Amino acid sequence: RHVQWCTISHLEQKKCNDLVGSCNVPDITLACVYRSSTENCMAAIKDGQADAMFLDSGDVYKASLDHYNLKPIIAEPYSLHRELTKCLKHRQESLGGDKMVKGRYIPQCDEKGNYHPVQCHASTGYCWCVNANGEKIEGTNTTPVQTPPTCPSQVLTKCLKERQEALGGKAIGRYIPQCDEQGNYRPMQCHGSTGYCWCVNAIGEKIEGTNTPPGNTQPTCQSHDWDTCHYAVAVVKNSSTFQFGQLKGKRSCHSGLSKTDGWNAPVNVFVEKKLLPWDGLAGSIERAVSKFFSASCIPGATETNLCKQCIGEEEKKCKSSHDEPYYGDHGAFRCLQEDKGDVAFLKNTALPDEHSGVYELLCPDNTRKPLNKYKECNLGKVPADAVVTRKAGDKTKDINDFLLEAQKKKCKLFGSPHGKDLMFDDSTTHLAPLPSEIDAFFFLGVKWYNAMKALTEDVKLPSKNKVRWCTINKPEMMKCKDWAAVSGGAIACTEASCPEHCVKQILKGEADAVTLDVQYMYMALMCGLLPAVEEYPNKDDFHPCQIPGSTIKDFGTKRAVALVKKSNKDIKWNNLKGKKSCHTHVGDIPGWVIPAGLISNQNDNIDIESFFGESCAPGSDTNSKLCKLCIGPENPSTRCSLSDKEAYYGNEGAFRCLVEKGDVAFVPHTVVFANTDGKNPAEWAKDLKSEDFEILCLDGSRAPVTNYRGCNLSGLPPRAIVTREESVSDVVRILINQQSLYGRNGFEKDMFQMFSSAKGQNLLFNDETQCLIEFDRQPKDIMEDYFGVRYYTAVYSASRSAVPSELIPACTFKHCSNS
Ligand SMILES: NC1=N[C@@]23[C@@H](N1)[C@H](COC(=O)NCCCCCCNC(=O)c1ccc(C(=O)O)c(-c4c5ccc(=O)cc-5oc5cc(O)ccc45)c1)N=C(N)N2CCC3(O)O
Numbered sequence: 001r002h003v004q005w006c007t008i009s010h011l012e013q014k015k016c017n018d019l020v021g022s023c024n025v026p027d028i029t030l031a032c033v034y035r036s037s038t039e040n041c042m043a044a045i046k047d048g049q050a051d052a053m054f055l056d057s058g059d060v061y062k063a064s065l066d067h068y069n070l071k072p073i074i075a076e077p078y079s080l081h082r083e084l085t086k087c088l089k090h091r092q093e094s095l096g097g098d099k100m101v102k103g104r105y106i107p108q109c110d111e112k113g114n115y116h117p118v119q120c121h122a123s124t125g126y127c128w129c130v131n132a133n134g135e136k137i138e139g140t141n142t143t144p145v146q147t148p149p150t151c152p153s154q155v156l157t158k159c160l161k162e163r164q165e166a167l168g169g170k171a172i173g174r175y176i177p178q179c180d181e182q183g184n185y186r187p188m189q190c191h192g193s194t195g196y197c198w199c200v201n202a203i204g205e206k207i208e209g210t211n212t213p214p215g216n217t218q219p220t221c222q223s224h225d226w227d228t229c230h231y232a233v234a235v236v237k238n239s240s241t242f243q244f245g246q247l248k249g250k251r252s253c254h255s256g257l258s259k260t261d262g263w264n265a266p267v268n269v270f271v272e273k274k275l276l277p278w279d280g281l282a283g284s285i286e287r288a289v290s291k292f293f294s295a296s297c298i299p300g301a302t303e304t305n306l307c308k309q310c311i312g313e314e315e316k317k318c319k320s321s322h323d324e325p326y327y328g329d330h331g332a333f334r335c336l337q338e339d340k341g342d343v344a345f346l347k348n349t350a351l352p353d354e355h356s357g358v359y360e361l362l363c364p365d366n367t368r369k370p371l372n373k374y375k376e377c378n379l380g381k382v383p384a385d386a387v388v389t390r391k392a393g394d395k396t397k398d399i400n401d402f403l404l405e406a407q408k409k410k411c412k413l414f415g416s417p418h419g420k421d422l423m424f425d426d427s428t429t430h431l432a433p434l435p436s437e438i439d440a441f442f443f444l445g446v447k448w449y450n451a452m453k454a455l456t457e458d459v460k461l462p463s464k465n466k467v468r469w470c471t472i473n474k475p476e477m478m479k480c481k482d483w484a485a486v487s488g489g490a491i492a493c494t495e496a497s498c499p500e501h502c503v504k505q506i507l508k509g510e511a512d513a514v515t516l517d518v519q520y521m522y523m524a525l526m527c528g529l530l531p532a533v534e535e536y537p538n539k540d541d542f543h544p545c546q547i548p549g550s551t552i553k554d555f556g557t558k559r560a561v562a563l564v565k566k567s568n569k570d571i572k573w574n575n576l577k578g579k580k581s582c583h584t585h586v587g588d589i590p591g592w593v594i595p596a597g598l599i600s601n602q603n604d605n606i607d608i609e610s611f612f613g614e615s616c617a618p619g620s621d622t623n624s625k626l627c628k629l630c631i632g633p634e635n636p637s638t639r640c641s642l643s644d645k646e647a648y649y650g651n652e653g654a655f656r657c658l659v660e661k662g663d664v665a666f667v668p669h670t671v672v673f674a675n676t677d678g679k680n681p682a683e684w685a686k687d688l689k690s691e692d693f694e695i696l697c698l699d700g701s702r703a704p705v706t707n708y709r710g711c712n713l714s715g716l717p718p719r720a721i722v723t724r725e726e727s728v729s730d731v732v733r734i735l736i737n738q739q740s741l742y743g744r745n746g747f748e749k750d751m752f753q754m755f756s757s758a759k760g761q762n763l764l765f766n767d768e769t770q771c772l773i774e775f776d777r778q779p780k781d782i783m784e785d786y787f788g789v790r791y792y793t794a795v796y797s798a799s800r801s802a803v804p805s806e807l808i809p810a811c812t813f814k815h816c817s818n819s
Pocket of ligand 1: 787
């Protein structure tokens, strides 16, 4: 296997060459491919001349466009503020679940708030080992009849790990970190041989401008500093006296035309303060900046005066390359240090370490402040930088494997004698893989993505009076174009292939609303969308639809229930183990998902196949225990099929299986009524009595089938129309108005019917929808708010950590954004 790294300069190629020598990763060989600039390397990677390069966040965005089609895959993890520990989060979440769901696992945290390596399930006596994230080491379960397992100790904190590694198994003359009680870095660190001291934040990163030689007083070190985002700054010499607002006509050094810290952040501020007579005139920004400064060095620029101060020899002058000595963060600082500029635009990680000196920060509030005050004297937080590769991802694994092994082996990735910031930022300490579905939008975050886009094109913002509806198939798209035609512009349409892609479009500002099945709301809520209105399906009460706002007696959603015959008097909820169960089919929420979640919650995620003695659940393996109850009609049937061929499939089918050969069936609450009291003509349901069956309650009691509102496994939440938080008010308003025209009682229901169609069934909305009711948002967790406490608990253990879609790690990726 091979990894071809693209380098942008002779210095960088030389460093990459050294690594080919000095870093030995078995199975994977590194090679280095030279190109003359960032852009030429991007094109090389798109063309397969190379596989990977490290890019500033500004180039990550540029690379993500169709010209190059690169994506970020690896970056240094960062942190915005201090968070609760996972174990304590988990404890709180699971203690806030539905107390009616008894015997749930509550994690055991230690005096530091971590997971005890041994975790146990009180109500079952089962114990197992966990990793630091509290996830079960599979294959370590021990039963109550045995002693708790012996589990390896948890991995040490970064500080105690660095401490132990520096000691190298028994210390002298080198830096050994000093740690506190909780195992985090002490704010003040000192070198035990040189007498130097400096500040670090809570994960051990050095605070620039704090390095203090012995015999000097140290700057104060902030404790509990968990803000590890990088900050764009403007650095100046203390021998000049101008303020930020007087920058017009000075000489400037920038890390580069396409760098966030060297271009986007300053230019953004220039524009907000109106120092730059430029608006949206798409007069380019570079041209406007060209009028602002007298002479600058801005690698990658074309205007002549914005290259006048660079000093690269011949063609290399003003190149986005280390061969231009003033390129990059350290190059811009060199350019100021050598007095070719009066101000340099770079980021805090490139500031001098030493407290004392001729340099300080130029704050946009027209004051100046010391180097170590960048957190309150800056031009904004900037996104992380990343290793990128082709969108296709053919080499992602090889690239990750190589960098994981090189870092384990401590190869010299993050410095070099040949110069600073070669291959990677010198300030980098660790590179981790990004979520697999991450793209530039989710990596940079919506605020920085739009801000970068806004510098290149006049981004017309879609109207707040128009709802762009997202459709998942052509019939829906056709019904939505009919809606647009009569809506008078209130409705437009977009096309996607599935509901999850609709969620993505709404997040990215390409659509405004979509209707989601329950099975997709967890993912949509985790990504930050909100219910706007919901489908009210109750045919027995139209009052909430006639008078909007009135109080709803029964939303009318289905209620999953445990159905048993009145004959079986021994079968309660707690003894369902090993019994005969009938399931409508695998994947059905009331017949499988809800029961699956409760059995899992209360029995250590033991397979539902193994839990029941024998069942019928169409869609399982024909040879399985869940299929032997199934009969299959005309015998070829095809037992355990997701068709009416199987006589136990569906709401009615599971009901048959119960009366025939089963102790319990899991079905919606409506199946019994619609199939007893002679409601089904078929023979087996020959006048079966509704008083012949009862439903199981979770407390071990029972109740007549009629009390399903108080004796159910869980009620389903209604389907919901979701949108962006800031668009909820608009969408509600537009939809309610449309409903007054084209709802079941709309004033123009002859023009168009929202809740039906000749083009197909359940297009956009469910055809059985009575109306859409505004979501009354309660002050509580949206998960609990939208799902209801019973469902949240039974299906998701009332946890914000389930990952039912791999989009979730990408859409919850945290950003380095401003306000
Ligand atoms: N924000 C928001 N949310 C709503 C709402 N607006 C709209 C519309 O929704 C509606 O239906 N409104 C119209 C009213 C029609 C009746 C519905 C009222 N049903 C309950 O309030 C309820 C739900 C779940 C459970 C549960 O089992 O946990 C219990 C319940 C208990 C909880 C803890 C406990 O120890 C004991 C409990 O004991 C019970 C005992 C019983 O005997 C019978 C029921 C319970 C009670 N849409 C949503 N998606 N929503 C989500 C949740 C929500 O309904 O609030």
